[PDB]
Write a protein that binds this ligand. Structure first.
Ligand SMILES: O=C(O)[C@H]1O[C@@H](Oc2cc3ccccc3oc2=O)[C@H](O)[C@@H](O)[C@@H]1O
Ligand SMILES: O=C(O)[C@H]1O[C@@H](Oc2cc3ccccc3oc2=O)[C@H](O)[C@@H](O)[C@@H]1O
Lengths: 627, 622
């Protein structure tokens, strides 16, 4: 179950396989088997990592439906593979992939936003190796994220009662129809790499938890004592593992040698005196170095069999009444939902962009975001660990309704996504909360609200069982009839998406604020902490008015000014994450002006009027103690 | 010299001639005179008032050089012309016109921004009359505004040393090359109307002045006594002068003797007078009624002249309105809009005045030509102060020696002041924009010798004797010897835009060095231009030139510096709104230094300035 990010050290090496690959589009329902067994005929170039859709303007790959096939060759010195365990890792292949090496299927995966890997020790050979990866972009009623098997995309226009329209639909070209509001970018969206570990015995997983903090300082920078726990899992086959705790300067401040017991694990606790805590706006990271010792322990030899360096931060998270406590201090979220989205790359990971976006989060005086609507690339979490930005980590369970709740295949994929996200991400101190879905159907009459609850409650429990830190769990709720939804109010933090004054009461900020206050009165009675995870207004940079109407920069600024003045009056409202950080691509349609334009930044990360207004507001709101 | 705006009353009627006229383009240096003798052949439609250039997308009338010909027919009842003096008034024909009625040349005019009229009493006849108006758009080294006879337009790019360029220039299509930074919009830009007066004796001109205020209230809303003067000129005995307040109540009145050349003049004391102020307009009406011999109750002629009671005085480094130290907040404007060009549009004037209030500004300058008369009436009623400017833009030493230019300059000054003298909203005259004033050898003295008589002329022409300025281009202020002699120093400066580009620290340092120079000069000083081209929608976290943020940052930094100077009495920025120019490599669909877009939408800087100006009082800021 461990998926530690590949590391290079004295016992391990990583060989990236990124670069310009060969590529062919394939069929709507299948691809040629022979393409895995020999070089692709007449290949196109395709950079990896990246979405494929915007990498070829001769083709219309945004319209592609079905399979594509990637391929490349590689060779490595025999000297480096000898005696080692060889693993091929795919950080993400969106949505489903079949991976072949030298004409043999290594295996398959479903789930477009989480990593998977194969043991290729026996499949590799000397000299050039031929790696082929078939990737399927199709979405439908059984995928996460969810597609529509017929009709229109989410937020699509129709005239379904016109006989000519009904007839033309029957014969129209097959297309993915997202039941979600972001473009279905597909392909090898994240890195590919070959890596090595020792074969006889190796470190397979590490979990670090902050179990307890004693006498936390007034400023939350330190605690008199921190109790941390480690759990190390091994693969392979009186053995021991040395655990060293390094502080921010790399000095060993704690260390223990633990017995490995059988499935093989070592676990224990370590007390850290005068512990330096991790906080939003004030990151501090330690490293847990795990070193597998040879048979005979340190008593017999100085050599190290295997090693892995796991970053971690010491901090607690606790929901208490209507507060969200980090290191016992009442936190207030400032930020937004994001997307992994950019020109050229699509959903492809881009660390230049991640580094820039983290600086923009600081420029705005924001302190947090949500990984709307899928787990992000691993590097972004490491960056937010070092930069003191809090994350709500969310699985790709977007577009769901009652059709999905009855389907065992969907429930299995949903559990896989929750387990996989938490297994990948559990050691990040920046992650303070898990989201098990975005905007599923929860309300209505008859049995529908109960059916939704019965689907989601076990997933809430799974997210708690899976996280060794036991962080809060939420479900991000779409604008709905909050009085018949019986699921959202059971979450640990209530996370609501609301578009009062945009999708309803349009343009009327007085009415919008009145409606918002009626719903806030409902949440006030429930007595849980509540935050916005979405609210906003599509905004075309450069459209201006003295009395700003919808789509103007002024309306977007006025929107936030009015709504935020209302939530400031509620002590139990513990965060404001708006929609969205930046404009992003969507399926085309009559309400999407070259995608979603609710960004406070443009797609090129330039600030609209509302961004300047929010920057000034957020400059004056502290991370702790605002409420 | 009186040019009272036409009025309808019991003794006078106005017959508007606006509408869709017939139109033809003509030649570079000529037009067919015979077109005045018959309907124009194969005419195009052309709305009047309006520039013609943007009224026909099949043609490229922005490229037109030379003459066009307008024409229409009209008829009026014989009973109404009978016994009357009939006057045909052109509010503006840009730049020069030959006017014919029924094939008879009435005369011509040069000067594209001031009204002119003809007595058509004898040329009119019963039934349909045919009015033909040839309009010349050409500009050059002897016109105001100034054109270039060769080379490029102002701030145009060139590669003059490339032989192919030099040769191609010799054979290129003739084009007006403005030596000014706005498009050369031409045609019947303002209204046309026929009007009547009595023929035997009539009112030709009226001047009302505020001579003295006694015991002005602390809030300047009133004075214990105001002494006003009237001067009424007649064409073609007694005149009754009645002073009506804001409710139409006659609060003062005198009957004055007419003496010959025929004029009546005197003074009237108004106790507890209600004063006109920026942000708090109050208007009276002086009604002049020509009485019959000798004498009966009946009225021979009448005219109703709006005015406001207020004084204007420069005192040391202060600009006093009703004895209170005023601070200018505002901008240069243009008469410029999509479709209309330089054409007057009162929907746009009403909207723009509301935007001036929305911004919390209190003033503007008529850059760079007198505006339509209706805009001044609007600013009279809306309490917005005006600096009134003649079209003497683009001038340099080439012009100062040209007698035709000098005569046209004197004509514009006399004509502007004769037309506009009664507006209380006008507090200062500008005799030029951005002429060449600095340099070495004899050049600075040559400029002074040209402009000083025009300064004196503006003072001699205005019965209110308001301050006179000359709006100065960014220049070597140490060798300019003319600007510092004006009543108010009005400077155009672009530190950080056209120089020290993008570096606001350096721009502010340079500005402060020049402010130190003006501090020593000891006159009141204001900005009349400063700004940055800005494309709405271009944004940056660290705003660079052309972004909305840079424009906002520009004003935030520069205004913080002038706030430190007690003698700096106003900030008029460039510009109220984006406007059209001749095309070139520094004009992105015109001049983009507007704080509003050309469609009057607010850029980031407009919101910032609105908040700043909201906190600055009209009186007492310094
Ligand atoms: O609409 C968006 O910009 C985002 O919408 C979110 O879901 C919601 C959509 C609608 C539509 C109509 C009326 C109310 C709604 O309230 C919502 O909460 C979605 O989570 C985002 O991914 C979309 O981009
Ligand atoms: O440039 C403008 O936007 C306005 O320029 C004014 O005259 C000046 C132009 C320049 C050019 C280069 C360096 C300094 C300058 O300083 C000026 O004062 C002119 O009055 C306006 O009409 C222009 O639109």
């Amino acid at each position: 179950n461990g998926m530690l990010y590949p590391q290079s050290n004295d016992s391990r090496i990583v060989f990236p396989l990124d670069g310009v690959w060969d590529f062919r589009t394939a069929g709507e329902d299948s691809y040629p088997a022979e393409w895995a067994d020999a070089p692709l005929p007449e290949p196109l170039p395709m950079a990896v990592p990246g979405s494929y859709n915007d990498q070829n303007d001769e083709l219309n790959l945004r319209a592609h439906y079905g399979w594509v096939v990637y391929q490349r060759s590689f060779a490595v010195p025999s000297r480096l593979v000898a005696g080692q365990r060889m693993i091929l890792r795919f950080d993400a292949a969106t949505h489903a992939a079949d991976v072949y090496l030298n004409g043999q299927l290594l295996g398959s995966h479903f789930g477009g936003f989480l990593p998977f890997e194969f043991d290729v020790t026996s499949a590799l050979h000397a000299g050039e190796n031929l790696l082929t990866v078939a990737v399927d972009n199709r979405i439908g009623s059984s995928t996460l994220p969810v597609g529509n098997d017929a009709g229109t995309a989410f937020m699509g226009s129709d005239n379904a009662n016109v006989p000519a329209v009904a007839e033309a639909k029957k014969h129209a070209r097959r297309q993915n129809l997202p039941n979600f509001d972001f473009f279905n970018f597909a392909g090898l969206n994240r890195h590919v790499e070959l890596y090595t570990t020792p074969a006889d015995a190796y470190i397979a997983d590490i979990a670090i938890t902050t179990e307890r903090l004693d006498h936390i300082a007034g400023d939350a920078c330190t605690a008199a004592n921190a109790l941390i726990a480690y759990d190390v899992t091994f693969g392979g086959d009186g053995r021991q593992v040395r655990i060293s705790i390094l502080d921010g300067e790399g000095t060993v401040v704690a260390g223990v040698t633990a017995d490995i017991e059988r499935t093989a694990k070592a676990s224990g606790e370590i007390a850290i005196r005068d512990a330096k805590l991790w906080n939003p706006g004030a990151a501090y990271l330690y490293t847990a170095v795990a070193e597998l010792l040879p048979e005979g322990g340190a008593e017999s030899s100085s050599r190290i069999i295997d090693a892995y360096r796991q970053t971690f931060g010491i901090r607690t998270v606790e929901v208490s009444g209507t507060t969200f406590l980090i290191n016992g201090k009442p936190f207030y979220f400032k930020g937004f939902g994001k997307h992994e989205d950019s020109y050229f790359h699509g959903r492809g990971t881009d660390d230049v962009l991640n580094v820039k976006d983290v600086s923009l989060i600081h420029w705005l005086h924001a302190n947090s975001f949500r990984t709307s609507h899928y787990p992000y690339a691993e590097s972004m979490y490491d960056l937010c660990d070092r930069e003191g930005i809090v994350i709500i980590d969310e699985v790709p369970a977007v577009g769901m309704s009652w059709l999905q709740y009855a389907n065992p295949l969907v429930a299995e994929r949903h559990r896989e996504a929750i387990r996989g996200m938490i297994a990948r991400d559990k050691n990040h101190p920046c992650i303070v909360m898990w989201s098990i879905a975005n905007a599923p159907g929860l309300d209505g009459d008859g049995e529908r609200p109960r059916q939704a609850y019965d689907y989601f409650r076990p997933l809430y429990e799974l997210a708690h069982a899976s996280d060794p830190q036991n962080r809060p769990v939420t479900l991000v709720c779409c604008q709905n009839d909050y009085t018949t939804d019986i699921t959202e109010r059971t979450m640990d933090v209530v996370c609501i998406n609301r578009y009062y004054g945009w999708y309803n009461l349009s343009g009327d900020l007085d009415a919008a604020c009145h409606a918002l206050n009626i719903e806030l009165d409902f949440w006030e009675n429930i007595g849980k902490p509540v935050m916005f995870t979405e609210y906003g207004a599509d905004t075309i940079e450069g459209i201006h008015g003295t009395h700003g109407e919808m789509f103007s920069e002024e309306f977007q600024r006025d929107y936030y000014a009015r709504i935020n003045a209302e939530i400031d009056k509620r002590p139990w409202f513990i965060g404001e994450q708006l929609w969205n950080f930046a404009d992003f691509a969507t399926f085309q349609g009559i309400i999407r002006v070259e995608g979603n334009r609710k960004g406070i930044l443009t797609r090129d990360r330039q600030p609209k009027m509302a961004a300047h207004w929010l920057r000034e507001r957020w400059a004056g709101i502290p991370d702790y103690g605002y409420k």
